[model samples]
Each structure stands twice: as structure tokens, then as C-alpha cells.
Target chain A: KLPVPWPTLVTTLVQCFSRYPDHMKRHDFFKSAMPEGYVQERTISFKDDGKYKTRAVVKFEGDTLVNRIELKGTDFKEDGNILGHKLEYNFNSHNVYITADKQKNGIKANFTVRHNVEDGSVQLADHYQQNTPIGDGPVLLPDNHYLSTQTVLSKDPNEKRDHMVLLEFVTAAGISASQGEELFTGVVPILVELDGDVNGHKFSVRGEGEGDATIGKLTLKFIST
Target chain B: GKLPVPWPTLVTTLVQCFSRYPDHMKRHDFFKSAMPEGYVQERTISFKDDGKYKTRAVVKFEGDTLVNRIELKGTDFKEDGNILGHKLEYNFNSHNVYITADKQKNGIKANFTVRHNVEDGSVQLADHYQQNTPIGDGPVLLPDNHYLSTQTVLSKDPNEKRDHMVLLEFVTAAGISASQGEELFTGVVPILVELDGDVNGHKFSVRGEGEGDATIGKLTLKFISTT
Candidate 1:
């Protein structure tokens, strides 16, 4: 199972950087909105662990998401093994496909989402279908190693009453099997789509990538505090 | 009991790059050069917090050289200031060999096998460090140590439909040293890795960088398509 609070997690991430100017591209926004190495820390106890305190820290690279994590009371066990005791999520690598011809320099936006649980003993599989051609096809491919969607209501700071949708669609995987097989079985993805405005927070994004399994999905309702 | 390997140590991977500059060039150029055959570089790095660290060669420059014998020994691994020994061997024909032993009371032992290669004068080492852990039985209560970390490239084979590929295995953090039950261990940074190569004849690469310990950060992937 994935180890993140999806909608809420996605909303918080968008809110952190979505307040910038519209002309601001993803990389530029990250460079200016957040410090080079900004870090945010919090504690949330999930329903799975009773009374066990989980500490989470969100790591940011300028405006892009790097990695975020949650660890429970130093030790949480399950299935004859430790679970959620340490939860790590990473955006390993990714590319953003810009539909606009003016912005297509193989324009890549590095936003990856990965779940690292317990000892981080996660194994990835071969997701590339050699016979398939990569195009403006399906955003989520059946062959992707990991695929999922996250949507939440966020505010468009520019529009006082406008409530928008904050979305992050991720799909990743190894190359097509026809090209070759993964040196090792454990693999992850490299593409995503973060669409919508969380209640007016509009971050125009587009892209499609590879996928194999559905990691998880979250639909969160945002109430600005 | 053996002491757990500590975390937060700086680890960097440097390749021969296979391209070298002239003598007049700066030292940085060597790091960027396309090193030719017979070039040598160290690959295996293991560090203990108690000011004890060791590194061994991942490959020998030529087909057979004394440098093929790679080994590491240190006293920072045991509680009573005892030493732990680790050694690795590589041969072009018979292939790979690795061993680990602790000098502490009722110590533990671990052994692993590895693969090596060199193409166009560049050295490449590949292995998962798993499935090779044959210490007479299943490993148990082994001290926290990175017995393996390596990288290599596989060229395209028309018959296999395999393109040029590179594989990496790294330990970003060192976990706890003790075991409570079967497979119950704490603080060990589980093995994680990245891969880069050609996809459908297109160039692609994946990199994981940044500080370890909650900071095994940054997953960057690059893909180039001719179409």
C-alpha cells in the first residue's frame, strides 16, 4: 500500500507553491517560491496506528517536490514485520509533456511520487511494452510500474471566490520489454500530470507517462484556514 | 554483539568517465575524461562512525592484476573495539567472490558473489548483493553494513533486443544493528537503486541524489526519443 495522505498531501503541496505568478513556469516557481533546501515538518497519527506518533517532514527543491516522509513512534509493526514505522515518498524522476508547441523542448518537469515503507524493500517491475509507441496516447499506461491520481479542492488566490481542483496524476515505469529487461526487477516511473486549481490555485500542467500497478488515489476536500 | 554501522556519512560515486584530458588540463578534467583501458578507480566504500572507514577496488584495469584482490578491515564494527574483516575477489574467468566476518564473541559472517566487465577500456561492475548471501545458512542478526554497492552497463544485443543499459545499487542509509525476531531489524537503509539506458533505441537515464538519512532525495529521469 502507498504511504501518503493523497488529497491532503497534494493540496498542501499545491498551496505551498501555487500562489506564484501565472507566467511562472514550474522550474522557475520552484527556484523563487521556496528556498533551495526548504523543509517542513509535522506530526500526524494515521488511523492504522493507534496512539503511535508519526512524524513527517516535507522536503522541497526550490518549487518542485523532492521527497516527504512519515515515521511512527520509531517502531510500528505489522504482518510479522514492521509497517509504517518509517514511510518515505519520493518523486524519483519525471518528465512533463507540454502540449504547446512553443514550450516543447522536450520540456521536462521533475515531479515524482514514490512510497518507501519499512526497510524500503520495495521491488519494481518491468513496465515498458516494446511493441507500443509512446505518443499523446493514454495518460496512464497499463504497463506502467506505478500509476495513480490525486485530486483536492484548493483556492485560486487570485480569484477570491473561485474554488478550483488540485490534481496530480502520476505514471512511471521501465522501458519496453522489447528494448531490454530491467537489470533488476524493482523499478519506478518518470512522468506525471498535475492539473486543476485548488479553489482558484491554477497550475496549468500536462503530460503522460508509463505505469504498471495502481499505487493509490485520493480525493480531498480543502477548507482554507 | 556487533555494533551497527552508523548513518549520515557522505558517499559519492565517481566513474572513470572513459575520457581523459591532456597533462596541461586541470585535475577536474580527469574526472570528466573518457578514461582509456588500463585506467583504475575505487568503487566499494564502507564507513563506520568511530573514525574508521575502508574502500576497496571494484575492478582491476587489465584482465589479471594483483589489484583484482579487493579487501577492507576495520575495528569500528564491534562493541569491544574488535575488528571486522571484509574482502572481495574478482577474476575474468571464475568471476566474483566476497566474504565478511566479525571478530566479536559469537560473531556473524556474510559472503556474496559479484560480476565484472570492461568494455572500450571502461570498467563496469554489476551485482544485487542478494541471492549471494550464503554464509552456510540464511543470514540472521547481521550487523548493519553495506556489504555491496556497485554499478555497470550492458550493451545492446540484437538477439535479446537489449539496448545499452546501466544498473546501480546503493545504500543511502545504515539501519540498526540488532534483530528482535526472524527478519525483524531496525535502522538499516534497505537497498535502493536506479537504471539508465536506451529505450526502443532512445537514450534514457535515471539518477537518485542528495544527502542520505531521510534525504536519499532527488529522482531525476531523462529520456530522448528520435521520433
Candidate 2:
């Protein structure tokens, strides 16, 4: 072995792969993207088949999952509170995730979990982000944004993997007088972290960006590239 | 045997008199507002800091003389690029009045929580280093490595008009006065109030820049009980 000191390669993240196993799933709207669905999980699409026309195009991009759904218009057919706009994408949440939403202008669904788990004394909780409007897809939801995570301090010793449960989620709701006036509408985005701990259960949370968390509210001004 | 009992005032004394202190901004003499007794609702919660930092926000209270719950909705900003508007919904569970302003839009999403706990007579204000405010396109986020917590204690000074002055100061180890992550509310915060009635006033004429809804001022409270 060389006498030089080994370069330390540490992952400065919360690490969610520990909970959600490393298994990729696939879906296609009745032979649209795939007649029988795909086995290879690079790019998957959940199109509209049943009633209305809305779809969730999920792109498994390097360590993060980007689920984009195009919201259109439907006459009337209620499916679990989500107005007549019936469409499902990555509905399965275990290995893969499937989302169903109304067919309006458009709204993208980005999924992630912030839990307290690491291999060291001091580290950041899970903080993985996903950008919307993938390739040639419908554009509505904002691109490049994320909620904050926590930083756990487990004394001098490591911690035993304790189960992190869904305590609660705070949604950043959008308010408007008229419905479809502007593109900057709707609110499905949220920002929260798992404040569980081994340090006697005393934990404080922080915003999404580590040193550069965009505090307050960030609404869309101008669009398109 | 017993001659004169000038005695001690309620919260009508001093802790750390910040009257002359540069950071402490107190000039709430021209105040006029009335809140009813026993669980008042829709009480106007106002705060205007048109000084060094344009820290302006509003709040409403729901409690007797001692506030039991509070809710705030306003903007804490420096400029257009960094304007934060949030609403802290009343959490009947936690004792501390926390700032759970987790909102997102456009291409940015922010998440942060500032907790203020009233422990005994002192208040514990705690916020994270990561969850920080940019104090001028700068780096105050990762400076002080203390217990991310500070307290509001009785300051050392003379008597106030109504007779009590509580100070919530945050300074470093080397006697340096600095902000504890809260952008607009830098340096120190002097907390004092104008009571409604006599000593045991039913309604409190709250007169300050902007304090809390859950736990009001924590000074005169302990003093009144101590006697």
C-alpha cells in the first residue's frame, strides 16, 4: 500500500436508500410507452387510459426521482377527492411511487423523505431534490427546488437504525382569487424534516439548501428557457 | 420594628437596562389598543421595525392576562430577492411559539423552524445554523458554535414607567453583541409592557415591536409570583 494518506470519500447527505430499497419499477399506460410495461427502469411513463387525459412522466435521474404530471381538463368523474381529472403515475410507493392528480394546467410531484440516519457523529439528514419539466414534457410545476433536512449529532458513537415515521408535513399552499389566471398557481410543495433523535430527542430543523436555503417564499416570475 | 416597605415592584424593575444600548430599540410610548380579558380573539398583533432592518410582522393572541396561544402572518424581508412571508398556525400542542414557515414556489423552497420556549422565568430561543438568514449576501450562518440557545433574563437597569423591563439579549463568549440567526432581529431585544389595571390587571396593554403569542413577556410574571 502507498504511504500516502487515503483520501476520505464521504457522502454528505441523509441517505434515504437505507429505507427505500434499491429496486426500480416500471409502468406504461396500456401500450402507449409500453404495451405490457417495461422491465428496464431507465425512463418510465404512466399515461391516461381509463377516463380523462393526464399522465405522470417519471424520470429516475441519478440518485433522485422526478415525477412530472400534466394537468388537463375532464368533464366529471371523481376518483378519491381529486376532481374528475383521473390519472395515475408511479402509484406504487414501496419500491417505486405512483401519483394520481387532477387534469388541469399541470403540476409535478417530486417525492422524498427526510430521516435521521448516518454513519458518523455529525451529518446532514436526507436532502435529495428533483427538478421538473423533464425533456419534452408538459411544463407547470417549478423546476429546481427542495425542502430542508436535519443534522443529527449522535455523541461520539454511532446510532442504531431507529424507524423514522411520518410525524407530519407542512404544505406551502398557494392562494389565488381567480383559478386559471397565471401559471404560478397551486401548492403541493412542502418543507419539513424528521426531528427524531438519539440525543435525548432534542432536535431542531433547517431549510432545504445546506448553507443556501432559499428562506421565505419563492414564487415563479418568468418561465420558459 | 417594621419601618418602611418601599418593597420591590412587580416586573417594575430591571434586568439589563438596554435603554441606551445601541441594539435595543424601544419607543412604544404612543400606544393605544385594548384586548378583552379571558381568551380574547382577533386581537390585532402589530410590529413595525422601520429601522436598520425593515423587520415588520403581525400577530394575534388568544389567552387571558398570560397569553396561552398566538398566531402570526407577515413578511420578514431585506429586499425583493429575499422576502419571506409566512403564517404560523396556532399549535395547541407545543408551549413554545414556533415559526414554522415552510413554503415553496417558483424554483425555490425553504424550510426552517424557530422555537421560543418559556422555561421558568427565562425564555429559550433556539434556531439552527443551517436554517439561517443571509445577513447581507454574507456568512453568519456558520459562525457561533454555542448551544444554539439563548434566554430572556431580567436586565440590570432602573425602573420602567409601568415598572418592569425584560431583556432578551444574544451575545457571543468574548462579550460581542451579534444576532443569533434571526436576521431582522439582530443585537438585542428589550421586552416591556403596559398593564391595564392595578397590580393584578385583568387585561394587558401589550406595547412592543413584536414579541410572541403563546408566551408573552417572561419577566414581571416571575416577579409577581415571587412576592
Candidate 3:
């Protein structure tokens, strides 16, 4: 199922973490920013207030697992139905959201996607310290920006890991829309990669960077079977 | 039983004189222009000159007529190819132009596609290049400059009026006729053209102009086809 066809892979990963308007942030709303799948079905439901409600339907045709419910949750609520349109998601919670039917109801801010399981690794959260204009306007520190990125996966704790996706932005922290200074601050790391088949999902994306950068050196190979 | 069916005749000319300044000025304003007309054929276009300006120009057809053949060679531009006729095949190495035709000549291929127009840079004299006429008008044609124009399509079957249509213009000045000792030439160059396509079932309209010197200007081509 994951050779892309489910309504363009969840509307290109929810418009690549939607939030625009700094003069509309120069295009590229996730033109397939590396996405390949497997995990077909998995379920677990049991709760007396101790925690457990899980569901996993990762059928990208050649790969995908999971089912459980009742707050053993680090955060995960995904939904589907693409040709007849309709998709929803609310993950790792810091107010993360993804809903589509061609954007039926808006208000999507900066990025965030977390899954640690004590350090198996999967984190992509970005925000420049908030610049208001939340719903319907596209603003998150539009001129006063901030960003963060970190990834250190698979150092071999005995293999069995295969599911980590992260993308980050917010490269500059500003004060000038016209004549105020202090141009940059921290958080640059854009792409980091690895893939070995948790069943059959191979994606190779090599990353790079050098002195003062904003997206440089990125290699995307291995579009899995 | 015929090879001299040479319906050939082409002439071209050029001139360019210009000056203009007005923002509360100080002496400057002058002008003169002419170029436009058609019919004759000879072809050879080479590419790569070390300054990083590559080239690829190809066209082929036998059903409506246009298969004289052309290919020039040079190096340091790397290579890739394609141009097989009788159905059509077009590929290249760079500046992007990929075409694939399918009806084998006369339903002339079906719905082929390739679109690369960098924000309306202007193209459709059958995709000629470089033209700027707005914003102080400093350039009307400059980017490997050359000149020629004529495009006419006529004959809606009123017992045929004999203006069937033709165009051929190639005059030069800029890095001296694009380097390497004068390859081909023969006079009177000006420019203008108009276009519309669908032949042999009748649909035509065409016009022509040429021969202007002393700061060249003036070229036109008009076309109409309906049946």
C-alpha cells in the first residue's frame, strides 16, 4: 500500500508540518519528503487506569503493525480514507495536528513529532518562540524565528529498530522586518537518515552541512520495494 | 523521379541604432529599425564554447516536409542524444527540451508533454529565444543575437490563392556570428513572424518582411488556417 497512493501519502505528511506566511515561505510543501511504509496491523486494548490503547495499520502494500488503547501513550492517533478524502492525526502532543479534506478547518502551527521509548529515537519539533496569529493566518514567530533538530539512532542495542522520520526548520531568529538586528540563533540540522527493513522499507537519505547553512548537502536514494 | 523540387528562396538584413534618457535628462534620444521576411534552407548549429553556454536545436518531419538534416560538433559540454523521425524522438543533455511524438508522422503523435517556461520568458515563434520590450526597453533581442522573421498560412480553398506560406531568417552580430569562421551566409536580413499549424487539409495565413540597415529594425509574419 505504501508505494504512495493513499491521498499522496497523507497530503505529503500534512503539508510538511504546516504553518506559513513569512511572505508564504517559498513553496515546497513536502513534495514527498522521504516516506516509505510497511507495518500492516497491530492492536492492544486494556485499561483500568494503568494505561493501554494502541492501533497500528501500516499497510503500504509491501510492509507495515499494532493495536492498543488507554494512555500507555506517548501520543499517537492516526486516521485515513484518501480517494474519498479524509485524514486525521494527533501525535506526541504539544498540540500536534493533521487533518485534511483539503484543509476543512485550519489552525496548524509549527512542527512536532516525538517518540523516544527511552531512546529508540524519533523527534522533530520546531518553533521560534511564537509570534502569534495561530488559526487562519500562518504565523509562528514569522519574523522572530527559532528552530531545533536532533537524531542519534541505531547504535545497535541488538537491532529490531526501523521507523524514524524527522524534518526540522526555523533557521533564523530575527527582529528586522525592516530595521532591527540580531539575525540568527542555533538549531540548523536539517536531514539525518538510516533504513534496514523492519520488514521491507528501504530508504537512503544522506545528509551534509558546512559553514553557515540553510539546507545544503542532502542525498535521497533507495526508494524501497 | 524528382530532387529539384526546390521551392527555395530566402533573404535577410539588419541595423541597430539606439539612445534614450529621461529622468530630467541631459542629451540622449535616437532610433532606427528594420528586419522581416522569408524562404530558403541550409542548416548546421554547433555547441559549447568554454564560457558555459551550451546548445541543442533539433527538428525533423517528412509528412508536412522539413527534413534537410543538421548536426555540428564541439567539446567540453558533455553529451547525450536523440532525434529519430517518422513518429518522433527528442531528448537532450541540458537546457531541458524533451519531446516524444506518437502517430508515426501524420496524426503527428498524441498529447506529448514537456513544459519549461521560467515565469513567462516568452517563447512561441516556435520557441525562439530572448525578447524583452518592457521596463525602459533596453533590450528587444540580446542573448546570442541574430535576426529573421516571416510566417504565413493561406488558402481556405477559394480555388487556392497561392500564398501557401514560408519563413527563413538568419542574420548575425554578437561574438561575430557565434565564433568559428563564417559557416554560412547570403544577404538582406530583417525580422517578423506569425504562426498556426495543421496542414494538407488546408488552413493558411502568412506575411513577410526584410532588408534594413543602419541600426536594423522591422519584421513581421501573420498566419491563418481554417478548413
Leading candidate by lDDT:
1
Per-residue lDDT of A1-225 in model 2, one digit per residue for the tens?
A: 111000100011111111110121111111111111111111111122111222334333332222333322233223311232221110111111222222432222333322111221211112122222223333223222222211111111132322111111111211111111111122223222212121122332221211111111121111111
lDDT of 1 by residue, A1-225 (tens): 222223223312321221112222222211222222222222322333322222222223332333332322322234312232244322222222211112321111212233334465531211111111113222111211211222222223354432333323332212112111111112222222333222223332222222221211121222221
Report how far off residue B53 is in candidate 2 (Å): 18
Per-residue lDDT of model 3, residues A10-57, tens digit only: 111112222232453432122111122111111211111111122221
Q: Rank the candidates by TM-score, best first.
A: 1, 3, 2
lDDT of each: 0.23, 0.20, 0.20
Please say which candidate is ahead in lDDT: 1 or 2. 1
**Largest DockQ belongs to which candidate?**
1
lDDT of 2 at B68: 22
What value of lDDT does candidate 1 attain over all alpha carbons? 0.23
- How much is the TM-score of the A chain of model 3? 0.19
